[PDB]
Amino acid sequence: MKFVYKEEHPFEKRRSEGEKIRKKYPDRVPVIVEKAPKARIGDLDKKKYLVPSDLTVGQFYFLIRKRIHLRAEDALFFFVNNVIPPTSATMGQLYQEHHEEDFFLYIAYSDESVYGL
Amino acid sequence: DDFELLDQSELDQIESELGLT
């Protein structure tokens, strides 16, 4: 999966901020959230989120919906490394396994059940 | 700070209202 944040902010500066932020905020994981390519739903103003590690994916859905113009007829799916993480996983679990080496977790959203369609 | 902190407090009452156990 490809994200604008990575293209705009170069690695060693991201990894810089990841290390910093992960040490100030206990029990809060840093995650970047971008609209997927080809997705047709509301854009998200802010990308950079600190999320309680014990917060479920299920709940993270609720919090992101709250922040985009989403009609009821619109579907919404998260993607981590091209795969939909289950609603039962914790943002903590998700960070542990799939955090990249800048210490960030990258999640894309879309209205299509398959990334980038 | 460019980071937005999400807190469960937003959800907490909702979950009660919808009947979470």
Residue numbers in the entry:
A (entry chain A): 1 to 117
B (entry chain B): 453 to 473
Copied sentences from the primary study:
The mammalian Atg8 family (Atg8s proteins) consists of two subfamilies: GABARAP and LC3. All members can bind to the LC3‐interacting region (LIR) or Atg8‐interacting motif and participate in multiple steps of autophagy. The endoplasmic reticulum (ER) autophagy receptor FAM134B contains an LIR motif that can bind to Atg8s, but whether it can differentially bind to the two subfamilies and, if so, the structural basis for this preference remains unknown.
Here, we found that FAM134B bound to the GABARAP subfamily more strongly than to the LC3 subfamily. We then solved the crystal structure of the FAM134B–GABARAP complex and demonstrated that FAM134B used both its LIR core and the C‐terminal helix to bind to GABARAP. The structure also allowed us to identify the structural determinants for the binding selectivity. We further showed that these properties might be conserved in FAM134A or FAM134C. Our work may be valuable for studying the differential functions of GABARAP and LC3 subfamilies in ER phagy in future.
